[PDB]
Amino acid sequence: VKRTHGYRYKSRKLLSKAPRERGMSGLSRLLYEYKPGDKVVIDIDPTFISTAPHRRYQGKVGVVIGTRGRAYVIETYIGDKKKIIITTPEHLRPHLGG
Amino acid sequence: MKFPKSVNMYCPRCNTYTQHSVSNYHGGQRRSLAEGQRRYERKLKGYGSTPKPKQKRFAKVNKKVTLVFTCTKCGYKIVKSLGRMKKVELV
Amino acid sequence: ARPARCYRRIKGPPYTREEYIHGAPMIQIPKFDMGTTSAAARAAFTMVAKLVAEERGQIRMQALEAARQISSKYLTKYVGDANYYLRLNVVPHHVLRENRMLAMAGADRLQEGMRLAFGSPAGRAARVEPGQVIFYVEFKPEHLAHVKEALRRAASKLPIPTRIVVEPK
Amino acid sequence: ARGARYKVPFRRRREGVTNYRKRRKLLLSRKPRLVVRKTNKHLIAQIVIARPHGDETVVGLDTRVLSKFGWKGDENNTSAAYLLGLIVGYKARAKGIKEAILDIGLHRPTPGARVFAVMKGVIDAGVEVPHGEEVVPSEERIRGEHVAEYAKRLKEEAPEAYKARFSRYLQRGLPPEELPSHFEEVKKKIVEYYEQKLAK
RNA sequence: GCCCCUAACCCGGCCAUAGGCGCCGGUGCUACACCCGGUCUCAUCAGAACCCGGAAGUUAAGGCCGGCGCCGCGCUCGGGAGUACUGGGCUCCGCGAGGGCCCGGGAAACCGGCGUGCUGGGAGGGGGC
RNA sequence: AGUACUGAUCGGGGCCCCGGUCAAACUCCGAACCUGCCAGCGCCGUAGAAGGGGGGAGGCGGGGGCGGUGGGGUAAGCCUCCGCUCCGAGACGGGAACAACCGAGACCGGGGUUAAGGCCCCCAAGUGCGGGCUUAGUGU
RNA sequence: CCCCUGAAAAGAUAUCGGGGGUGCCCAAAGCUCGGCUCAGGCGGGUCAGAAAUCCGCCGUAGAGUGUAAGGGCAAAAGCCGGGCUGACUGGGCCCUUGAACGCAAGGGGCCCAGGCGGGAAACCGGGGCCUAGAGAACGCUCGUGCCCCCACCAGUGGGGGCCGGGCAUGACAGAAAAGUUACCCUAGGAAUAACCGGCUCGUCGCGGGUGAGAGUCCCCAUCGACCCCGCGGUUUGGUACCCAGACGUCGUCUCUUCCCAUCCUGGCGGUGCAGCAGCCGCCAAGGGUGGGGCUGCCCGCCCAUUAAAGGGGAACGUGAGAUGGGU
Ligand SMILES: [Mg+2]
Ligand SMILES: [Mg+2]
Ligand SMILES: [Mg+2]
Ligand SMILES: [Mg+2]
Ligand SMILES: [Mg+2]
Ligand SMILES: [Mg+2]
Ligand SMILES: [Mg+2]
Ligand SMILES: [Mg+2]
Ligand SMILES: [Mg+2]
Ligand SMILES: [Mg+2]
Ligand SMILES: [Mg+2]
Ligand SMILES: [Mg+2]
Ligand SMILES: [Mg+2]
Ligand SMILES: [Mg+2]
Ligand SMILES: [Mg+2]
Ligand SMILES: [Mg+2]
Ligand SMILES: [Mg+2]
Ligand SMILES: [Mg+2]
Ligand SMILES: [Mg+2]
Ligand SMILES: [Mg+2]
Ligand SMILES: [Mg+2]
Ligand SMILES: [Mg+2]
Ligand SMILES: [Mg+2]
Ligand SMILES: [Mg+2]
Ligand SMILES: [Mg+2]
Ligand SMILES: [Mg+2]
Ligand SMILES: [Mg+2]
Ligand SMILES: [Mg+2]
Ligand SMILES: [Mg+2]
Ligand SMILES: [Mg+2]
Ligand SMILES: [Mg+2]
Ligand SMILES: [Mg+2]
Ligand SMILES: [Zn+2]
């Protein structure tokens, strides 16, 4: 049968967690104030999956464009198309490679 | 599923939350003076085959549950759909 | 049954999850350890003989059973059960499938040819690697000739080439 | 504990001091937190800014600071809570904080509690802290009239029980029946001190 | 005010080197506690708890610090092992499934060794400005 | 790789401990490898990168070799996916013929040198050189 | 449509591939605040018990979380209690369906304004912890607006319009729809079957290894359980490469040739070979292998003989040679 495409349709390994990673995660990712121009990494947190971006954006580097209430607007690229990911800080990490 | 016969709900005309009575939606009777009905009777007059399609195969098992909320203060009516399921019981 | 050459070659992933396999056959091998199995009495035995695979392939459960009977019968007749320990080291976890039109086995088995070609279960096999130890014998050094003969007779019933390796415990 | 699959909780959770659900909700505010903590002897008031590598405490004080202004009441009654809140609010206003969110931790938010007394003192010092109108204790309890009434009844009824139950007040030189007036003098001292400091 | 140094207390970060079991100690002016009561705020079947008011008692317990053994855990440590596996090339072997050579990468289990919280801010205390 | 979660599975010893066999729909660990951003190298680019607009399409039947034990199948010059390359749409040398195997990319004419492969004759180039094995015309 | 696997550690990924589910259900199974801790085990306790309520110790989740599968969850996302209806009104942007790369509906996320609920506050609430339960045009109906229009002007009744909800197409990017043809006709197709041919050999025929067991004893004179390795292309099947402007479809007759895995004839050996006979193996294809009864047959069975009355290939040899019983 042709592949079904739910919003989380091949995400077993990506949303699984190791036994040492179980439960709540630390709150330090909430406390990063990203300014426009900052570089972030999209690293999905499985405990907050309802606000997480799609699996195709995991491990991608984006640029903060603005803030919308409590989320951040991130301009990234999927191959060659420009995509906008609006996500909260718990799925983001600061990019240290410049 | 059971739904109350009265709810507290925002009223756009009152611009505040008021008590709304709850009833089932009932479609009105088709009036013969409607433009589409007039065109249909015109098409029905004369010789020929049956002039319009008529569905034979139906697939839905339930209709979308439609309810009318009437503001008790001003009589404003809000018709909403609760989704496709069996008929609700007003309680 | 089909010839064993039909299932000798490893051609796909292992098929072992019995909670997903419908109508998986039972393992017909009745016992796997022969002779004096208690380690307190195995302390007497000092020689280890090993029938070891030479190629990679699949051995059917019936082939493993036939080798087991021939070796165990020889060892009982000529060494006695108190003087050896014999273990069939592999278990037939893999489930074999065959595509054939047949009796009441599903409505998709009544369509002929390669349409709906995923076969039904047909038997069990043990997937083995080169150098894998198929048969393990512990014995006293005086019975070396009889143990080698039993291993040769067991090897005659298997679908892949093997060899006998003798060493001390 | 036993086996690799056991997940040890957070250190502060297993020591029993941080509710991380409530802490996450507080951290969503992005405002400074007025942390109020109770001990058996003192009250701790802090203005904290949370940072990714560790919280930063702008101002922190327990009720030992009231001795600098000459407090002779108990260390952690409602009046002491109010005075501590006043001092912490004035210090925070000096250091530039104008708004804060109350953080009571594992304590219960019962109305008229000492945490709300501290919050009322902070509000009166000039720092805005959001709150309901029904949780701050009455002005009588803030002045300490409940302590005075209890001391008066105890002195009338069981004088030896009065001496036993308020020995430290008598050692300090303030009978518990004179608590409201002394609270008024100390509050006047603190207000005058920090208002002159703010003017200068 | 400000700088430096520093226990137990408060707010944290990473979230077992931090956990678990057992044994042996230290700590008590202050701080943290156990503790003493229920008039008031508040609370329940229950002042146990929560909440309030205290200070007679005690370091017995908690907390914090030091030592030992075990379990678990961690490590860019030695072995396992350049092994398993693998990116590229081949008129190289094998009947064949497969294997081999060259260039480039390179584990894991397990065994032994070592380690068994580290750290940011504040209060308090000490020394200067 | 492991058998620690979910399952199977053979023995020993006292529900646990020890050894042993497995997992497409198991996972503490975990490469090669692929991939995102930045800096550099390399190369391309002002004789014009990125980006955009307009006209006209063909085509929307593919195939071969090699690799994913790819998944299926007894197997198939079999069915269905993934990647490089070649045929289709590519001359030419070798392979005894032979689209896709090896070499190699052809404007025309000539000279030379090499690639694959070959050098007893057919057939250009060796009845070339050292050691060893085969007696089956095995084999070439 | 949705989940896991296939899927080869970015993305994408198919088969009448494997394991399953969906067309709902719930006024609480939705929102929020607080308290608590589950399965299970152990000790004590009136009726009381394996299991009721009670006191305590252990208990990493071994429970529960509506519903598939996967994932998540312990001062909670579970259980109980309090208060509620945000399953809200008007709008915007983004993600996915739909990869890079055009493209419905549906679904999810982030917000602004209005007005609320819970809460001390922070904060959350635009249904269900997350990934499924989903429907264009035309027509009709309902809600809404001091709303717009209806032909020279005004009025009355009536009609239409913009915005939003519903009534449905499940073949779910949306015709309203039963057979039969052997009486058949057309346009094409080796993109696609039937015969032969090709590939493959499961099946079929044949050969070998092994030796439990039988053979009075004795594995191997003669067999050969349980298994395993092969060969042929002699049946059947698989596939669909060639051939639809056409290769005449079974059997028989007639005639020639080839193979050997040999039925007799030549040679040899073993024997459980006394003789007569029989059985088994090897070389060997020069010759022979016939006449009848039964069925269209091939095959098969039978009759009387005989040294014996072998089996196969040749476009299932041979219909521009016949025959025409069968199909
Ligand atoms: Mg698709
Ligand atoms: Mg949701
Ligand atoms: Mg395969
Ligand atoms: Mg293994
Ligand atoms: Mg990959
Ligand atoms: Mg196509
Ligand atoms: Mg290809
Ligand atoms: Mg050639
Ligand atoms: Mg020549
Ligand atoms: Mg992928
Ligand atoms: Mg659901
Ligand atoms: Mg809750
Ligand atoms: Mg689509
Ligand atoms: Mg696209
Ligand atoms: Mg959908
Ligand atoms: Mg006119
Ligand atoms: Mg369609
Ligand atoms: Mg064809
Ligand atoms: Mg055919
Ligand atoms: Mg023909
Ligand atoms: Mg056969
Ligand atoms: Mg034999
Ligand atoms: Mg055939
Ligand atoms: Mg042809
Ligand atoms: Mg023709
Ligand atoms: Mg012809
Ligand atoms: Mg013709
Ligand atoms: Mg012969
Ligand atoms: Mg013919
Ligand atoms: Mg003819
Ligand atoms: Mg002819
Ligand atoms: Mg006829
Ligand atoms: Zn109204």
Side-chain angles (χ1 to χ4, degrees), chain A residues 4 6-7 10-12 20-21 27-28 33 36 40 49-50 53-54 63 68-70 78 82 89-91:
Chain A
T4 73
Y7 202 77
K10 270 265 185 187
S11 319
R12 171 169 188 174
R20 280 290 285 263
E21 229 155 44
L27 308 187
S28 61
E33 232 170 35
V40 299
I49 194 58
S50 78
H54 201 266
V63 189
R68 207 187 275 179
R70 196 171 81 68
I78 292 263
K82 198 247 280 164
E90 45 252 45
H91 308 285

PDB file of all heavy atoms in Angstrom, chain A residues 4 6-7 10-12 20-21 27-28 33 36 40 49-50 53-54 63 68-70 78 82 89-91:
ATOM      1  N   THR A   4       1.089   6.112   4.026  1.00  0.00           N
ATOM      2  CA  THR A   4       0.162   7.047   4.639  1.00  0.00           C
ATOM      3  C   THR A   4       0.927   8.247   5.174  1.00  0.00           C
ATOM      4  O   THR A   4       2.072   8.129   5.611  1.00  0.00           O
ATOM      5  CB  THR A   4      -0.624   6.384   5.767  1.00  0.00           C
ATOM      6  OG1 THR A   4       0.231   6.197   6.895  1.00  0.00           O
ATOM      7  CG2 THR A   4      -1.155   5.052   5.327  1.00  0.00           C
ATOM      8  N   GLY A   6       0.266  10.898   7.822  1.00  0.00           N
ATOM      9  CA  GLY A   6      -0.204  11.681   8.937  1.00  0.00           C
ATOM     10  C   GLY A   6       0.808  12.743   9.261  1.00  0.00           C
ATOM     11  O   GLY A   6       1.854  12.839   8.628  1.00  0.00           O
ATOM     12  N   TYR A   7       0.501  13.566  10.259  1.00  0.00           N
ATOM     13  CA  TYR A   7       1.468  14.588  10.634  1.00  0.00           C
ATOM     14  C   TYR A   7       2.702  13.980  11.286  1.00  0.00           C
ATOM     15  O   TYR A   7       3.779  14.577  11.247  1.00  0.00           O
ATOM     16  CB  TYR A   7       0.832  15.625  11.552  1.00  0.00           C
ATOM     17  CG  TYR A   7       1.571  16.941  11.546  1.00  0.00           C
ATOM     18  CD1 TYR A   7       1.438  17.826  10.491  1.00  0.00           C
ATOM     19  CD2 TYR A   7       2.407  17.292  12.590  1.00  0.00           C
ATOM     20  CE1 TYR A   7       2.115  19.020  10.482  1.00  0.00           C
ATOM     21  CE2 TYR A   7       3.087  18.482  12.586  1.00  0.00           C
ATOM     22  CZ  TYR A   7       2.938  19.342  11.532  1.00  0.00           C
ATOM     23  OH  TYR A   7       3.610  20.534  11.530  1.00  0.00           O
ATOM     24  N   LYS A  10       6.319   8.676  10.306  1.00  0.00           N
ATOM     25  CA  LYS A  10       7.436   7.746  10.409  1.00  0.00           C
ATOM     26  C   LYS A  10       8.292   8.118  11.605  1.00  0.00           C
ATOM     27  O   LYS A  10       9.520   8.144  11.538  1.00  0.00           O
ATOM     28  CB  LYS A  10       8.240   7.716   9.113  1.00  0.00           C
ATOM     29  CG  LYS A  10       7.750   6.688   8.110  1.00  0.00           C
ATOM     30  CD  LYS A  10       8.534   5.400   8.224  1.00  0.00           C
ATOM     31  CE  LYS A  10       8.136   4.408   7.159  1.00  0.00           C
ATOM     32  NZ  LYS A  10       8.767   3.085   7.368  1.00  0.00           N
ATOM     33  N   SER A  11       7.642   8.418  12.727  1.00  0.00           N
ATOM     34  CA  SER A  11       8.292   9.107  13.831  1.00  0.00           C
ATOM     35  C   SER A  11       8.496   8.230  15.057  1.00  0.00           C
ATOM     36  O   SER A  11       8.633   8.758  16.161  1.00  0.00           O
ATOM     37  CB  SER A  11       7.488  10.350  14.203  1.00  0.00           C
ATOM     38  OG  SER A  11       7.025  11.022  13.049  1.00  0.00           O
ATOM     39  N   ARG A  12       8.531   6.907  14.894  1.00  0.00           N
ATOM     40  CA  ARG A  12       8.724   6.029  16.042  1.00  0.00           C
ATOM     41  C   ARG A  12      10.097   6.227  16.668  1.00  0.00           C
ATOM     42  O   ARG A  12      10.216   6.494  17.870  1.00  0.00           O
ATOM     43  CB  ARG A  12       8.542   4.575  15.627  1.00  0.00           C
ATOM     44  CG  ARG A  12       8.932   3.598  16.707  1.00  0.00           C
ATOM     45  CD  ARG A  12       8.507   2.206  16.371  1.00  0.00           C
ATOM     46  NE  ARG A  12       8.710   1.301  17.491  1.00  0.00           N
ATOM     47  CZ  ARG A  12       8.310   0.040  17.514  1.00  0.00           C
ATOM     48  NH1 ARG A  12       7.692  -0.507  16.484  1.00  0.00           N
ATOM     49  NH2 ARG A  12       8.537  -0.691  18.598  1.00  0.00           N
ATOM     50  N   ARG A  20      17.193   6.616  30.238  1.00  0.00           N
ATOM     51  CA  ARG A  20      17.803   7.658  31.053  1.00  0.00           C
ATOM     52  C   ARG A  20      17.272   9.043  30.729  1.00  0.00           C
ATOM     53  O   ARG A  20      17.580   9.989  31.458  1.00  0.00           O
ATOM     54  CB  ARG A  20      19.317   7.643  30.873  1.00  0.00           C
ATOM     55  CG  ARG A  20      20.035   6.580  31.668  1.00  0.00           C
ATOM     56  CD  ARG A  20      20.003   6.865  33.150  1.00  0.00           C
ATOM     57  NE  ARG A  20      20.931   7.927  33.509  1.00  0.00           N
ATOM     58  CZ  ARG A  20      22.154   7.734  33.980  1.00  0.00           C
ATOM     59  NH1 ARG A  20      22.635   6.522  34.183  1.00  0.00           N
ATOM     60  NH2 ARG A  20      22.912   8.788  34.255  1.00  0.00           N
ATOM     61  N   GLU A  21      16.490   9.188  29.663  1.00  0.00           N
ATOM     62  CA  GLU A  21      15.948  10.470  29.245  1.00  0.00           C
ATOM     63  C   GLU A  21      14.468  10.610  29.562  1.00  0.00           C
ATOM     64  O   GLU A  21      13.827  11.548  29.084  1.00  0.00           O
ATOM     65  CB  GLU A  21      16.174  10.666  27.747  1.00  0.00           C
ATOM     66  CG  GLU A  21      16.780  11.991  27.378  1.00  0.00           C
ATOM     67  CD  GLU A  21      17.536  11.931  26.070  1.00  0.00           C
ATOM     68  OE1 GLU A  21      17.018  11.329  25.106  1.00  0.00           O
ATOM     69  OE2 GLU A  21      18.649  12.493  26.002  1.00  0.00           O
ATOM     70  N   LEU A  27      14.595  22.954  32.113  1.00  0.00           N
ATOM     71  CA  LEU A  27      13.908  24.177  31.736  1.00  0.00           C
ATOM     72  C   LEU A  27      14.838  25.232  31.158  1.00  0.00           C
ATOM     73  O   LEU A  27      14.401  26.358  30.924  1.00  0.00           O
ATOM     74  CB  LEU A  27      13.159  24.743  32.938  1.00  0.00           C
ATOM     75  CG  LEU A  27      12.226  23.789  33.677  1.00  0.00           C
ATOM     76  CD1 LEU A  27      11.444  24.540  34.715  1.00  0.00           C
ATOM     77  CD2 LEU A  27      11.290  23.092  32.726  1.00  0.00           C
ATOM     78  N   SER A  28      16.106  24.895  30.922  1.00  0.00           N
ATOM     79  CA  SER A  28      17.062  25.892  30.453  1.00  0.00           C
ATOM     80  C   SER A  28      16.747  26.370  29.046  1.00  0.00           C
ATOM     81  O   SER A  28      17.033  27.523  28.711  1.00  0.00           O
ATOM     82  CB  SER A  28      18.479  25.333  30.515  1.00  0.00           C
ATOM     83  OG  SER A  28      18.612  24.202  29.683  1.00  0.00           O
ATOM     84  N   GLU A  33      16.756  33.827  25.367  1.00  0.00           N
ATOM     85  CA  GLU A  33      16.087  34.914  24.669  1.00  0.00           C
ATOM     86  C   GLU A  33      16.783  35.096  23.329  1.00  0.00           C
ATOM     87  O   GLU A  33      17.913  35.588  23.270  1.00  0.00           O
ATOM     88  CB  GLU A  33      16.122  36.196  25.494  1.00  0.00           C
ATOM     89  CG  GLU A  33      14.765  36.843  25.687  1.00  0.00           C
ATOM     90  CD  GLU A  33      14.794  37.960  26.710  1.00  0.00           C
ATOM     91  OE1 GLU A  33      15.821  38.668  26.786  1.00  0.00           O
ATOM     92  OE2 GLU A  33      13.795  38.130  27.440  1.00  0.00           O
ATOM     93  N   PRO A  36      16.422  38.748  16.845  1.00  0.00           N
ATOM     94  CA  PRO A  36      16.399  38.612  15.385  1.00  0.00           C
ATOM     95  C   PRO A  36      17.803  38.550  14.810  1.00  0.00           C
ATOM     96  O   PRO A  36      18.653  39.392  15.097  1.00  0.00           O
ATOM     97  CB  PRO A  36      15.660  39.870  14.926  1.00  0.00           C
ATOM     98  CG  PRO A  36      14.874  40.301  16.099  1.00  0.00           C
ATOM     99  CD  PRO A  36      15.660  39.917  17.305  1.00  0.00           C
ATOM    100  N   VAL A  40      19.527  29.162  15.331  1.00  0.00           N
ATOM    101  CA  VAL A  40      18.991  28.145  16.219  1.00  0.00           C
ATOM    102  C   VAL A  40      18.966  26.817  15.486  1.00  0.00           C
ATOM    103  O   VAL A  40      19.000  26.754  14.259  1.00  0.00           O
ATOM    104  CB  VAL A  40      17.581  28.503  16.732  1.00  0.00           C
ATOM    105  CG1 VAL A  40      17.619  29.791  17.515  1.00  0.00           C
ATOM    106  CG2 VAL A  40      16.612  28.613  15.581  1.00  0.00           C
ATOM    107  N   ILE A  49       4.965  17.272  22.067  1.00  0.00           N
ATOM    108  CA  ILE A  49       4.896  16.970  20.642  1.00  0.00           C
ATOM    109  C   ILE A  49       3.858  17.817  19.924  1.00  0.00           C
ATOM    110  O   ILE A  49       3.980  18.065  18.720  1.00  0.00           O
ATOM    111  CB  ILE A  49       4.625  15.472  20.436  1.00  0.00           C
ATOM    112  CG1 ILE A  49       4.888  15.089  18.983  1.00  0.00           C
ATOM    113  CG2 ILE A  49       3.210  15.137  20.821  1.00  0.00           C
ATOM    114  CD1 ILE A  49       6.281  15.390  18.525  1.00  0.00           C
ATOM    115  N   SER A  50       2.832  18.280  20.635  1.00  0.00           N
ATOM    116  CA  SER A  50       1.746  19.000  19.979  1.00  0.00           C
ATOM    117  C   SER A  50       2.199  20.348  19.439  1.00  0.00           C
ATOM    118  O   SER A  50       1.583  20.880  18.512  1.00  0.00           O
ATOM    119  CB  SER A  50       0.586  19.176  20.947  1.00  0.00           C
ATOM    120  OG  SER A  50       0.857  20.214  21.860  1.00  0.00           O
ATOM    121  N   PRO A  53       7.628  21.096  15.624  1.00  0.00           N
ATOM    122  CA  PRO A  53       7.544  21.153  14.164  1.00  0.00           C
ATOM    123  C   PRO A  53       7.544  19.756  13.563  1.00  0.00           C
ATOM    124  O   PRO A  53       7.667  18.745  14.252  1.00  0.00           O
ATOM    125  CB  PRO A  53       8.785  21.948  13.755  1.00  0.00           C
ATOM    126  CG  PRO A  53       9.681  21.902  14.915  1.00  0.00           C
ATOM    127  CD  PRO A  53       8.877  21.669  16.143  1.00  0.00           C
ATOM    128  N   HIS A  54       7.391  19.716  12.245  1.00  0.00           N
ATOM    129  CA  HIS A  54       7.355  18.454  11.524  1.00  0.00           C
ATOM    130  C   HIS A  54       8.704  17.748  11.615  1.00  0.00           C
ATOM    131  O   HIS A  54       9.735  18.369  11.868  1.00  0.00           O
ATOM    132  CB  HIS A  54       6.976  18.709  10.065  1.00  0.00           C
ATOM    133  CG  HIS A  54       6.440  17.510   9.347  1.00  0.00           C
ATOM    134  ND1 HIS A  54       7.239  16.679   8.596  1.00  0.00           N
ATOM    135  CD2 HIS A  54       5.185  17.019   9.244  1.00  0.00           C
ATOM    136  CE1 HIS A  54       6.501  15.721   8.069  1.00  0.00           C
ATOM    137  NE2 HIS A  54       5.251  15.905   8.446  1.00  0.00           N
ATOM    138  N   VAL A  63      17.220  30.769  11.162  1.00  0.00           N
ATOM    139  CA  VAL A  63      17.508  32.128  11.592  1.00  0.00           C
ATOM    140  C   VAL A  63      16.252  32.689  12.237  1.00  0.00           C
ATOM    141  O   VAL A  63      15.166  32.621  11.652  1.00  0.00           O
ATOM    142  CB  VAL A  63      17.950  33.006  10.409  1.00  0.00           C
ATOM    143  CG1 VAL A  63      18.461  34.336  10.902  1.00  0.00           C
ATOM    144  CG2 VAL A  63      19.002  32.298   9.595  1.00  0.00           C
ATOM    145  N   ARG A  68       6.473  35.878  18.145  1.00  0.00           N
ATOM    146  CA  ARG A  68       5.017  35.947  18.074  1.00  0.00           C
ATOM    147  C   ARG A  68       4.465  35.468  19.406  1.00  0.00           C
ATOM    148  O   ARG A  68       4.213  34.278  19.592  1.00  0.00           O
ATOM    149  CB  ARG A  68       4.477  35.131  16.927  1.00  0.00           C
ATOM    150  CG  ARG A  68       3.161  35.639  16.421  1.00  0.00           C
ATOM    151  CD  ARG A  68       2.593  34.709  15.398  1.00  0.00           C
ATOM    152  NE  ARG A  68       3.127  35.001  14.080  1.00  0.00           N
ATOM    153  CZ  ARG A  68       2.820  34.323  12.987  1.00  0.00           C
ATOM    154  NH1 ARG A  68       1.976  33.310  13.021  1.00  0.00           N
ATOM    155  NH2 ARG A  68       3.380  34.667  11.835  1.00  0.00           N
ATOM    156  N   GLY A  69       4.312  36.395  20.338  1.00  0.00           N
ATOM    157  CA  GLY A  69       3.720  36.093  21.620  1.00  0.00           C
ATOM    158  C   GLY A  69       4.706  35.412  22.537  1.00  0.00           C
ATOM    159  O   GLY A  69       5.299  36.034  23.418  1.00  0.00           O
ATOM    160  N   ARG A  70       4.916  34.129  22.304  1.00  0.00           N
ATOM    161  CA  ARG A  70       5.909  33.371  23.037  1.00  0.00           C
ATOM    162  C   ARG A  70       6.710  32.462  22.132  1.00  0.00           C
ATOM    163  O   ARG A  70       7.724  31.919  22.572  1.00  0.00           O
ATOM    164  CB  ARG A  70       5.243  32.534  24.131  1.00  0.00           C
ATOM    165  CG  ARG A  70       6.190  32.026  25.181  1.00  0.00           C
ATOM    166  CD  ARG A  70       5.437  31.395  26.331  1.00  0.00           C
ATOM    167  NE  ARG A  70       5.017  30.027  26.045  1.00  0.00           N
ATOM    168  CZ  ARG A  70       5.839  28.997  25.897  1.00  0.00           C
ATOM    169  NH1 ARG A  70       7.150  29.138  25.983  1.00  0.00           N
ATOM    170  NH2 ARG A  70       5.331  27.792  25.659  1.00  0.00           N
ATOM    171  N   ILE A  78      14.068  23.867   3.212  1.00  0.00           N
ATOM    172  CA  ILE A  78      13.934  22.438   2.956  1.00  0.00           C
ATOM    173  C   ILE A  78      14.364  22.226   1.511  1.00  0.00           C
ATOM    174  O   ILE A  78      13.568  22.336   0.577  1.00  0.00           O
ATOM    175  CB  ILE A  78      12.516  21.923   3.204  1.00  0.00           C
ATOM    176  CG1 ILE A  78      12.186  21.982   4.692  1.00  0.00           C
ATOM    177  CG2 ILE A  78      12.380  20.504   2.709  1.00  0.00           C
ATOM    178  CD1 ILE A  78      12.395  20.685   5.403  1.00  0.00           C
ATOM    179  N   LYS A  82      11.979  28.103   0.795  1.00  0.00           N
ATOM    180  CA  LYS A  82      12.024  28.809   2.062  1.00  0.00           C
ATOM    181  C   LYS A  82      10.790  28.480   2.890  1.00  0.00           C
ATOM    182  O   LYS A  82       9.660  28.675   2.435  1.00  0.00           O
ATOM    183  CB  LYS A  82      12.110  30.312   1.829  1.00  0.00           C
ATOM    184  CG  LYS A  82      12.585  31.070   3.029  1.00  0.00           C
ATOM    185  CD  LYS A  82      11.492  31.946   3.584  1.00  0.00           C
ATOM    186  CE  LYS A  82      11.364  33.233   2.794  1.00  0.00           C
ATOM    187  NZ  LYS A  82      10.070  33.912   3.068  1.00  0.00           N
ATOM    188  N   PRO A  89      10.424  27.922  22.390  1.00  0.00           N
ATOM    189  CA  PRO A  89      11.844  27.648  22.666  1.00  0.00           C
ATOM    190  C   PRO A  89      12.160  26.226  23.099  1.00  0.00           C
ATOM    191  O   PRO A  89      13.326  25.834  23.012  1.00  0.00           O
ATOM    192  CB  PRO A  89      12.192  28.643  23.778  1.00  0.00           C
ATOM    193  CG  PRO A  89      11.082  29.575  23.877  1.00  0.00           C
ATOM    194  CD  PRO A  89       9.916  29.096  23.112  1.00  0.00           C
ATOM    195  N   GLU A  90      11.189  25.438  23.561  1.00  0.00           N
ATOM    196  CA  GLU A  90      11.506  24.094  24.035  1.00  0.00           C
ATOM    197  C   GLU A  90      11.907  23.139  22.919  1.00  0.00           C
ATOM    198  O   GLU A  90      12.425  22.060  23.213  1.00  0.00           O
ATOM    199  CB  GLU A  90      10.331  23.499  24.805  1.00  0.00           C
ATOM    200  CG  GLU A  90       8.991  23.694  24.156  1.00  0.00           C
ATOM    201  CD  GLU A  90       8.136  24.694  24.895  1.00  0.00           C
ATOM    202  OE1 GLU A  90       8.661  25.759  25.273  1.00  0.00           O
ATOM    203  OE2 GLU A  90       6.937  24.415  25.099  1.00  0.00           O
ATOM    204  N   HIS A  91      11.670  23.490  21.661  1.00  0.00           N
ATOM    205  CA  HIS A  91      12.121  22.699  20.528  1.00  0.00           C
ATOM    206  C   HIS A  91      13.305  23.332  19.816  1.00  0.00           C
ATOM    207  O   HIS A  91      13.656  22.896  18.719  1.00  0.00           O
ATOM    208  CB  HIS A  91      10.973  22.490  19.543  1.00  0.00           C
ATOM    209  CG  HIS A  91       9.728  21.961  20.173  1.00  0.00           C
ATOM    210  ND1 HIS A  91       9.592  20.649  20.563  1.00  0.00           N
ATOM    211  CD2 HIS A  91       8.567  22.570  20.497  1.00  0.00           C
ATOM    212  CE1 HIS A  91       8.396  20.470  21.088  1.00  0.00           C
ATOM    213  NE2 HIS A  91       7.755  21.622  21.062  1.00  0.00           N
TER     214      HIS A  91
END
